Amino acid sequence: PTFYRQELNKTIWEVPERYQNLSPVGSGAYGSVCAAFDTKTGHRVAVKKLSRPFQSIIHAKRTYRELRLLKHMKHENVIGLLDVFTPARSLEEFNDVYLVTHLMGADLNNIVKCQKLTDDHVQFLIYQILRGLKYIHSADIIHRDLKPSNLAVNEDSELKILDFGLVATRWYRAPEIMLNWMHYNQTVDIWSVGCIMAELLTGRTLFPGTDHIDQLKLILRLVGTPGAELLKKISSESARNYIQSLAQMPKMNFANVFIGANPLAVDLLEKMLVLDSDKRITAAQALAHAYFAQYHDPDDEPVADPYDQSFESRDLLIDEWKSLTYDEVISFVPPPLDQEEME
Ligand SMILES: Nc1nccc(-c2c(-c3ccc(F)cc3)ncn2C2CCNCC2)n1
Ligand SMILES: NS(=O)(=O)c1ccc(N2C(=O)CCC2=O)nc1
Ligand SMILES: NS(=O)(=O)c1ccc(N2C(=O)CCC2=O)nc1
Ligand SMILES: N[C@]1(CO)[C@H]2C[C@@H]3C[C@@H](C[C@H]1C3)C2
Ligand SMILES: [Ca+2]
Ligand SMILES: [Ca+2]
Ligand SMILES: [Ca+2]
Ligand SMILES: [Ca+2]
Ligand SMILES: [Cl-]
């Protein structure tokens, strides 16, 4: 393919003539993103150019990690790869990596910002998040920083999770992540979903804390003071002593917090916004909840193929990560344009 150069976001992009009319649509993880027109299929796409992907072993391994993760994802509610390219003609010149996926116009903040959402619409949005989470969790991939800005949404409210498995808002983070509690499982992401759903229903951030301590206080005012058993998970004595020292707070009745909401929404929120992660509902259990009855379809809530993450434990030299990444670029096989059939 012939490549052309264009200055975008103050740097030179080098892309195949296949992709035209590039225009910037914001930063992404470790890179910046352009919308483009794919002349081969007539589809709109988003192209992410990774920023200095082989600067250090940290950049090199995260480049490999992101390419491995995105090549594995084949789910309608999870960002996956349509293409990956480099202008390099050999490993010796290999220095830039571009990732291509379907174009999604907005993030979830652009859906809820200037719109009073209906309950049926909130159901659809949360249903999609949970469907994608069931899929990535089934491959032992956790998001760990799920938030509205990491939920890509198109013009028809179709949603995909992005930047999974990889100063930022902490308002949606699971408390065990934000506070570095010694144990955490895949339901960290379910706390985030609760936080997002609450905001879709009320138009207000649920836990808008100014710092870690302030946010924990807002959290404990909703869910109540924890039992001694959850202190088991907290390494620092100073943090444990602090929590133990706060005046006892009862759990609030969520029906008095989400006034006038679908009682089924309140019930689901009660199951998700639980301080102890071992008591939280899973994404797969949440999909069977009556709140989603009009959308739930067991035949269309698939799990993932096994995902080999053994590379995560390994320290390799920068040129080995670079070569492994080049291998994954060269071996990529684009999906068919149409991968779905009528039910
Ligand atoms: N507009 C749009 N459409 C799809 C994805 C993205 C995208 C990607 C991304 C990831 C992988 C890839 F291969 C290509 C692009 N990373 C961050 N974003 C965000 C850019 C602005 N915030 C919302 C989405 N942006
Ligand atoms: N925090 S609040 O008192 O501003 C508030 C705002 C909105 C709401 N709400 C509705 O109106 C419909 C569903 C829902 O949850 N509840 C509380
Ligand atoms: N997901 S759940 O519905 O099983 C569940 C489990 C436990 C709890 N909970 C606690 O842990 C302390 C207070 C409280 O209400 N809430 C919901
Ligand atoms: N955001 C709210 C009410 O505005 C604050 C007060 C109380 C506990 C948390 C969650 C709700 C209810 C913080
Ligand atoms: Ca899960
Ligand atoms: Ca269906
Ligand atoms: Ca089809
Ligand atoms: Ca069917
Ligand atoms: Cl694999």
Specify the pairing of strand 31-38 against strand 19-28: antiparallel
Distance separating alpha carbons of residues 100 and 276, to the nearest angstrom: 38
Strands (E), the chain: 3-8, 11-16, 19-28, 31-38, 43-50, 83-85, 98-102, 106-107, 151-153, 159-161
Q: Which helix (H) or strand (E) holds 108?
A: helix 108-112
303 is in an annotated binding site: no
Distance separating alpha carbons of residues 103 and 107, to the nearest angstrom: 12
288, amino acid identity:
A
Which strands sit side by side in the sheet containing 151-153, from one edge to the other? 106-107, 151-153, 159-161
Question: Relative to the CA of 259, which ligand 2 atom is closest?
Answer: 16
128, amino acid identity:
Q
User: Cα–Cα distances in Å, from 226 out to 110, 190, 220?
Assistant: 35, 18, 8
**Long-range residue pairs from 266-271, CB within 8 A, at least 24 positions apart, any chain:** 267/291, 268/197, 269/194, 269/197, 269/198
Q: How far is CA 80 from the centre of its chain?
A: 12
CB 198 within 8 A of CB 269: yes
Compute, in angstroms, the gap from residue 343 CA to the centroid of ligand 6: 7
Assigned token pair, 293? 């009855």
* Three-class SS state of 136: helix
Assigned token pair, 151? 């939920």
The pocket of ion ligand 7, defined by CB under 5 A, consists of: 338, 340
Q: Which of 163, 211, 267, 338 is catalytic?
A: 163
Task: For ligand 1, pick from 8, 13, 33 the residue to mutate: most ligand atoms within 8 Å of CB.
Answer: 33
Helix, strand, coil in percent for the chain, rounding step 5? 40, 15, 45
Assigned token pair, 100? 């291509």
Distance separating alpha carbons of residues 59 and 119, to the nearest angstrom: 42
DSSP 257-272: TSTT--HHHHHHHHHH
Assigned token pair, 192? 């985030």
Residue 44: phi, psi to the nearest 5? -85, 140
Distance separating alpha carbons of residues 62 and 277, to the nearest angstrom: 27
**Residue with CA nearest ligand 4 atom 5:** 218
CB 53 within 8 A of CB 136: no
88 is in an annotated binding site: no
- Of 62, 127, 76, nearest in space to 304 by CA: 76
* Matching residue, tokens 């999609």: 128
- Of 199, 135, 123, 200, nearest in space to 161 by CA: 135
- Resolution attained, angstroms: 1.5
Distance separating alpha carbons of residues 327 and 66, to the nearest angstrom: 14
DSSP 165-227: T-----TTS-HHHHTT-S---TTHHHHHHHHHHHHHHHSS-S---SSHHHHHHHHHHHH-PPP
CB 272 within 8 A of CB 264: no
End-to-end, the C-alpha distance of the chain in Å comes to 38
What are the beta bridge partners of residue 98? 49, 85
CB 53 within 8 A of CB 325: yes
Distance separating alpha carbons of residues 304 and 168, to the nearest angstrom: 29
**Residue with CA nearest ligand 3 atom 8:** 274
Tell me whether residue 140 is one of the annotated catalytic residues.
Answer: no
Ligand showing the shortest atom-to-Cα distance for residue 337 = 7
Compute, in angstroms, the gap from residue 253 CA to the centroid of ligand 3: 12
Q: Taking CB atoms and a 6 Å cutoff, what residues make up the pocket around ligand 4?
A: 204, 206, 218, 221-222, 257
* Matching residue, tokens 């570095």: 180
Compute, in angstroms, the gap from residue 267 CA to the centroid of ligand 4: 17
